[PDB]
Design a protein around this ligand. Structure first.
Ligand SMILES: [Zn+2]
Ligand SMILES: [Zn+2]
Lengths: 764, 716
């Protein structure tokens, strides 16, 4: 079971300090909370790997078929007790770099010849150190100030970027938040429009600002639309906002400069005067058709006029059908199993959404779409721009005010206050022996080499794949340096560097000893999810199973102690690799037509692509907590239980959450005592599933259940949609879709015996 | 007297024919040398006339449809009337029961030759005024234009509908009646649009809207919006002209009224402050290196924006004309604005064309409020949706028309094969007309003939009316009554009617051959109507009826109308605009300016336009229709520079200066295009304006030597 592993690693490593001083050290599991101190290598909160010990020969990599990858969360939220990142400045010369591989100054560069010159680990080239940075030595190859300067002893730090890194070699401008609202009949009726306006007044105050300044430099603009764009002039001196309506959709243009993007604190009374009227303005609107791509095309051109990056907060209702560039038809069609062209269902209908996405990223424009579907919406097409741009997609199926209100406002407060950078580019440099060849995440690329992110937050993550090049060296090992150049919310060019060393090995045993199952799944999930747009689903599913079997067959065949021909020998690191793999193969994204909406398939496919390992572990193996057993006035953590219907009692109550939904399950024999202390109603048959809002009445349990619900939501970016479920013949048919160790694909004992039948096919 | 006949028939019927006695044969009319033509003023002011208030009676024959007029013979006991054009018998409507020999209806009395009827058409439409304002100007000119636009808004009747389109780098269509907010639809200043496209983009149905709303309803909102109107925010770099999209904005103003209120009276009043720099309708490049088109630049094929530019505004004109709307242009700038391209818009519709220096001038502010001149009853002096129908006797066919009109191509028996100017029709459409509007109708031949002029229009009170003027002139046998025909020659009218043709040819594909032709006809005229022994130049004598004609031709061929290489293209298009519009009295002043002389010895007296009238002890007052010039003689200039005027002894001298200035202030209130005033004297920098107004037949030559090469050629 996965539970037995998680607790076994929580016991040996939890509550202890993990110091990253060893070269090829193996960090704990994501589930295991432990204090981290940055010595040498970067923290696993920033970057984890599939294997912390690479093979040395490319032929050996083909033998084990173990993927060499890493999951980088470059702006992960460092805890309050862990030491923060240090900012480094190398003056006018800019950060010191190698003259061959262009790698930045890091602890991996040994100083020699009296500190006069240094040799790069990545290429081994030697650079005469700039004199200002020179003149420091130690008895044994240690800069005297080696400890003082963070770029010489830490693995995570930030550089100050000179002007030759910026666009047009000129200092950048602060970004801008452009809020754009759909105002068709769909959102006027369900009361969403006035909600956005009323609650925007509150959270415009909370737009991020730095400690060094006293007021956020982020300016703010406003637009509404329904097949026709409505611009707003909210300059500081106006007592009344001006509206400029554009109908030339197709050759869209921005009709205004200086009546747009004004500092919120300056035009406060003017913006609030607008936010009170927009609800009243479109109340009697009967328009139902709307545009979409011209809205993004407009917000992009507005950011180019002010010559600054920005983030588009788009709120949309239903499918865009109005005649315009980006018009979406209803293209859902019987085309998935062995279709060989099912990949079209996961791709944008028109060819322009890719070109619009390219234009946005080039000008540092990000879009975060808040989608409120009530019918088919084509997530594959709408979400392509807010995914290629590094934004987020918030989808709320069949929005109802008395229910999903709190869920949406919690996600809007979250995406505004996110520590976000802009106009970012990533570049993963490696030592002589390998290079980065493929990339996964919300990103766009032109050069094989560079990853471009219009905006990146603390929750995004990129998964990088490595392929062997020439031969690795057992003495040096394998080195990784990730560099993210970007722009701050105060408009300052800044680099962030992550350095991670790993050790090579000529022995196949050390390969499997140093595997993280949580990270292996993150790569495999994204890997399949990207090939969905190219190859049939049954083809990809064969690739996943065969590679998993070939991995557990090479450990068995090549170096495993001789065991019986009825046993499956798996190492400690890959104890749960088959279970997790079988859960990824049961996710709806790789499944058939019946009972699964394509938009939910496209929605889940986008969500995983941006996942950090920590998240990927929860979305695929949910957490199941039994509540009835929990004893009041007890330590808060209740141990998780295996994910199956078997570990449930009719009597029992459980909590399930994968990071996006949260289910409160109730057995038919659930004790009426707990039901009264939580649901305020006497019996089990007195609960209404449709009234799934936060209940507050209670003193021992309704405070206890609400306490454990809060700690679960804590480390999770998306605020989970609560779904209360009764046992017999209720909408639990959806609840069983997350009990991933249940059949519903093959089972666990079958997949094990499946791995073993190809364990013996690779005769050895 | 025949001079009494011309003046009485002009004040009564509003017409002035080149010949008031017509030849009965087609051949001798061809050799007359001046075609039978007439200046016609359909709505010539007639305080005396009272509108009838009953439908006109028309001949029952379909192709005739002439109005009941005094020329029709009436059998009162039989209650019938014979239409004098087609001799058809017609009955009287039942309301005409009590018609008698002594209580006949008004339309049969000779005095009421021309009369106006009140049409019971049925739709009393409100007037429509659409403002199209340029924002690419300084705050001074804009703040005054804002002051002037609110003044016009205060005069419009309460039921009229108003609209506002502001254009700069982009075009804006404001929605009036916006409450607690102001919203305005915006369009690219680089793309043209159709009427259907704007109908769908603005959200409108086919055939009060949100853009055109009553005056009594939006006065508070509009006078607040015009006050808050600031200039074009888009800054202009160095050496560049502001990105002004004049042609695009006018197209939207045309299309807006085309899909909301078509086939009804309206005025598109576009105020511009400079040339159009952003097409379509582009006039000049945005960079200030490239200068404005010059009559030389345009003659060397060096104006890459004229052909495409005029073509654009030429299509907007026929769109607004066919729909029935009026395009006004109020261009005030320090350089040309594109009037040569945009001339077609206020020339085909009966719109105005006002040229000036800036809007902050008392020149413009006065001229603009003259447009809103009310009658005594309190209604504007404008007329909209004019349909001019002309019928002639079977021996007469219409060649064509020159002036503010558009052909309806109404083929009929009164349409001649050989058409002149705007021809091939007996029906024209004048979108906007005033009591001053005057057309030139040209006729042809193949007991007295008859011509009837029917004009239907919308009165500014909304009322639908028809103006009918019927006139008749006696036929003649030219082989016996040459004296009877030459006695009817209107030398004044024939001078303007011929000038009317010569200018229309200057618009036309023809070059300086107009000078060669204008002299050939003058030679032909003097050859036929002059008493002389051949080859004796001194023997040549004019009849007094023809005396002033060779002098009129002299001042015409030398005027600014045919010699454009001394003015700018926007100026030449302006002068020609007003000449094709005025009646006889003003058109003569245009060709041959009046001149007055003020002296101690004698009251003010007119004098010849030669240097022989310029004296040292005399003050001169020139009056070309476009400018007033007061000239002080050398002796009077000295007495003026010394200061004798203040001294109470010279009460006589201080009054001598006030006599021309007081009469100058008179003409600066009555004349609708307020002229440019000039206070110069002997040796002033502005004295050039008077000295200039004072094979081919002849080059630039004095009046006397022009008469001599006319004499020696008329006798050969
Ligand atoms: Zn290097
Ligand atoms: Zn008749």
């Amino acid at each position: 079971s996965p539970i037995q592993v998680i607790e076994n690693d929580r016991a040996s490593r939890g509550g202890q300090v993990y110091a990253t001083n060893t070269r090829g050290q193996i960090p704990p599991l994501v589930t295991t909370d432990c204090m981290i101190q940055d010595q040498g290598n970067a923290s696993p909160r920033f970057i984890r790997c599939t294997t912390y010990c690479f093979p040395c020969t490319s032929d050996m990599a083909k033998q084990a078929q173990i993927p060499l990858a890493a999951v980088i969360k470059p702006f992960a939220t460092i805890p309050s007790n862990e030491s923060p990142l240090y900012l480094v400045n190398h003056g006018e010369s800019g950060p010191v770099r190698c003259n061959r591989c262009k790698a930045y100054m890091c602890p991996f560069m040994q100083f020699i010849e009296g500190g006069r010159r240094y040799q790069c680990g990545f290429c081994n080239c030697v650079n005469d150190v700039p004199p200002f940075y020179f003149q420091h030595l130690d008895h044994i190859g240690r800069r005297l100030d080696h400890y003082e300067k963070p770029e010489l002893s830490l693995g995570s730090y930030e550089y100050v970027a000179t002007l030759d890194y910026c666009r047009k070699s000129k200092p950048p401008n602060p970004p801008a938040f452009i809020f754009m609202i759909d105002v068709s009949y769909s959102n006027i009726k369900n009361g969403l429009v006035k909600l956005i306006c009323e609650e925007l007044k509150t959270m415009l105050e909370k737009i991020p600002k730095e400690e060094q300044e006293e007021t956020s430099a982020i300016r703010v603009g406003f637009i509404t639309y329904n097949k026709v764009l409505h611009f707003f002039n909210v300059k500081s001196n106006l007592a009344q906002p001006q509206m400029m309506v554009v109908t030339d959709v197709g050759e869209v243009f921005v009709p205004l400069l200086d009546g747009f993007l004004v500092n919120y604190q300056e035009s406060q009374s003017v913006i609030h005067n607008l936010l009170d009227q927009i609800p009243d303005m479109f109340a009697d609107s009967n328009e139902n058709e709307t545009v979409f791509a011209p809205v993004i095309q407009a917000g992009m051109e507005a950011l180019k006029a002010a010559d600054c990056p920005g983030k588009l907060f788009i709120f949309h209702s239903s499918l865009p059908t109005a005649e315009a560039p980006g018009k979406l038809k209803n293209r859902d069609d019987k085309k998935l199993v062995n279709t060989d062209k099912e990949k079209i269902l996961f791709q944008p209908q028109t060819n322009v959404y890719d070109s619009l996405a390219k234009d946005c990223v080039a000008h540092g424009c990000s879009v975060t779409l808040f989608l409120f579907p009530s019918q088919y919406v084509d997530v594959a097409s709408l979400g392509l721009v807010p995914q290629l741009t590094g934004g987020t997609l918030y989808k709320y199926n069949n929005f109802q005010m008395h229910l999903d209100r709190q869920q949406f406002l919690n996600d809007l407060r979250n995406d505004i206050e996110k520590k976000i950078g802009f106009d970012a580019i990533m570049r993963v440099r490696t030592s002589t022996g390998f290079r980065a060849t493929d990339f996964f995440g919300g990103i766009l690329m032109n050069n094989t080499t560079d990853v471009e992110m219009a905006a990146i937050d603390c929750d995004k993550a990129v998964t990088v794949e490595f392929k062997h090049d020439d031969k690795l060296s057992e003495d040096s090992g394998a080195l990784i340096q990730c560099a993210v150049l970007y722009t701050t919310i105060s408009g300052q060019r800044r680099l962030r560097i992550h350095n991670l060393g790993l050790n090579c090995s000529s022995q196949l045993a050390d390969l499997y000893k140093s595997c993280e199952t949580d990270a292996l799944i993150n790569f495999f999930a994204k890997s399949a999810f990207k090939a969905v747009l190219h190859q049939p689903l049954k083809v990809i599913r064969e690739i996943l199973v065969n590679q998993t079997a070939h991995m557990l067959a090479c450990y068995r065949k090549n170096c495993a102690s001789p065991s019986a021909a009825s046993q499956l020998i798996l190492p400690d690191s890959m104890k749960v690799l088959p279970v997790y793999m079988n859960c990824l193969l049961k996710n709806c994204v790789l499944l058939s037509r019946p009972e699964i909406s394509t938009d939910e398939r496209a929605y889940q496919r986008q969500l995983v692509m941006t996942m950090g390992v920590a998240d990927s572990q929860l979305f695929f193996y949910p957490q199941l907590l039994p509540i009835h057993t929990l004893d009041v006035k007890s330590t808060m953590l209740p141990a998780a239980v295996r994910c199956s219907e078997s570990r449930l009692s009719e009597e029992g109550i459980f909590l399930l959450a994968n990071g996006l939904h949260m289910f409160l399950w109730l057995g038919v024999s659930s004790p009426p005592e707990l039901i009264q202390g939580i649901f305020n109603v006497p019996s089990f048959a007195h609960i209404n599933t449709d009234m799934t809002l936060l209940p507050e009445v209670g003193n021992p349990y309704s405070q206890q259940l609400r306490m454990i619900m809060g700690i679960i939501q804590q480390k999770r970016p998306y605020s989970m949609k609560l779904t209360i479920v009764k046992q017999r013949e209720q909408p639990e048919m959806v609840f069983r879709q997350f009990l991933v160790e249940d059949k519903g694909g093959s089972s666990y004992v079958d997949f094990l015996c499946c791995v073993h039948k190809e364990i013996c096919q690779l005769l050895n | 007297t025949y001079l009494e006949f011309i003046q009485q028939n002009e004040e009564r019927d509003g017409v002035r024919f080149s010949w008031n006695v017509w030849p009965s044969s087609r051949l001798e009319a061809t050799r007359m040398v001046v075609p039978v033509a007439a200046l016609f003023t359909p709505l010539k002011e007639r305080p005396d006339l009272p509108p009838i208030q009953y439908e006109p009676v028309l001949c029952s024959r379909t192709t005739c449809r002439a109005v009941l007029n005094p020329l029709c013979q009436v059998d009162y006991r039989a209650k019938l009337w014979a239409c004098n054009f087609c001799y058809q018998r017609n009955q009287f409507p039942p309301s005409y029961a009590g018609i008698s020999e002594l209580n006949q209806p008004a339309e049969l009395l000779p005095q009421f030759s021309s009369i106006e009827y009140v049409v019971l058409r049925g739709p009393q439409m409100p007037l429509i005024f659409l403002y199209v304002v340029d924002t690419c100007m300084e705050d001074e000119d804009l703040q005054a234009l804002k002051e002037s636009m609110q003044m016009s808004l205060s005069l419009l009747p309460p039921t009229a509908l108003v609209g506002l389109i502001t254009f700069g780098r982009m075009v804006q269509v404001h929605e009036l009646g916006c409450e607690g907010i102001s919203k305005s639809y915006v369009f690219r200043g680089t793309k043209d649009l159709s009427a259907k496209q704007l109908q769908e983009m603005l959200g409108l149905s086919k055939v009060s809207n949100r853009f055109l709303q009553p005056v009594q309803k939006i006065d508070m909102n509009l006078t607040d919006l015009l006050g808050e109107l600031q200039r074009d925010p888009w800054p202009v770099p160095q050496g560049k002209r502001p990105l002004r999209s004049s042609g695009v904005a006018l197209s939207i103003a045309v299309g807006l009224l085309e899909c909301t209120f078509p086939n009804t009276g309206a005025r598109i009043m576009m105020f511009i402050g400079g040339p159009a720099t952003q097409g379509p309708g582009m006039v000049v490049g945005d960079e200030l290196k490239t200068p404005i088109r010059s009559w030389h630049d345009i003659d060397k094929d060096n104006a890459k924006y004229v052909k495409k530019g005029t073509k654009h505004f030429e299509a907007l004109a026929n769109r607004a004309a066919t729909t029935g709307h009026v395009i006004d242009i109020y261009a005030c700038a320090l350089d040309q604005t594109g009037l040569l391209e945009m001339k077609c818009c206020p020339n085909l519709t009966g719109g105005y064309m006002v040229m000036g220096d800036s809007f902050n001038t008392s020149l413009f502010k006065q001229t603009f409020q003259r447009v809103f001149t009310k009658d005594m009853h309190g209604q504007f002096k404008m007329g909209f949706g004019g349909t001019l129908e002309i019928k002639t006797s079977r021996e007469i066919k219409i060649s064509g028309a020159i002036g503010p009109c558009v052909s309806l191509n109404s083929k009929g028996p009164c349409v001649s094969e050989n058409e002149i100017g705007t021809g091939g029709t007996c029906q024209w459409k004048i979108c906007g007309l005033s009591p001053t509007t005057t057309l030139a109708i040209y006729f042809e031949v193949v007991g007295r003939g008859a011509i009837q002029f029917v004009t239907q229009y919308q009165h500014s009170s909304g009322q639908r009316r028809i103006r009918v003027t019927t006139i008749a002139r006696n036929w003649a046998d030219a082989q016996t009554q040459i004296q009877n025909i030459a006695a009817s020659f209107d030398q004044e009218a024939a001078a303007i009617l011929m000038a009317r043709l010569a200018i229309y040819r200057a618009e036309t594909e023809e070059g300086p051959d107009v000078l060669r032709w204008l002299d050939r006809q003058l030679i032909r005229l003097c050859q036929k109507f002059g008493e002389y022994h051949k080859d004796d130049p001194s023997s040549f004598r004019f009849s007094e009826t023809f005396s002033l004609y060779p002098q009129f031709m002299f001042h015409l061929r030398r005027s600014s109308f045919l010699q454009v290489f001394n003015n700018s293209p926007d100026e030449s298009s302006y002068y020609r605009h007003h000449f094709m519009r005025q009646d006889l009295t003003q058109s003569l002043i245009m060709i041959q300016p009046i001149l007055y002389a003020y002296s101690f010895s004698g009251p003010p007296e007119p004098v010849l336009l030669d240097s022989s009238s310029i004296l040292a002890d005399r003050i001169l007052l020139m009056d070309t229709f476009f400018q007033i010039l007061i000239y002080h003689g050398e002796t009077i200039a000295q007495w003026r520079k010394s200061g004798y005027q203040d001294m109470p002894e010279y009460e006589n001298f201080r009054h001598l200066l006030q006599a021309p200035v007081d009469d100058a202030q008179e003409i600066l209130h009555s004349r609708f295009p307020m002229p440019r005033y000039i206070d110069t004297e002997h040796g002033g920098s502005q004295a050039r304006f008077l000295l200039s107004k004072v094979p081919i037949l002849t080059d630039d030559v004095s009046l006397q030597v022009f008469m001599d090469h006319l004499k020696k050629l008329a006798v050969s």
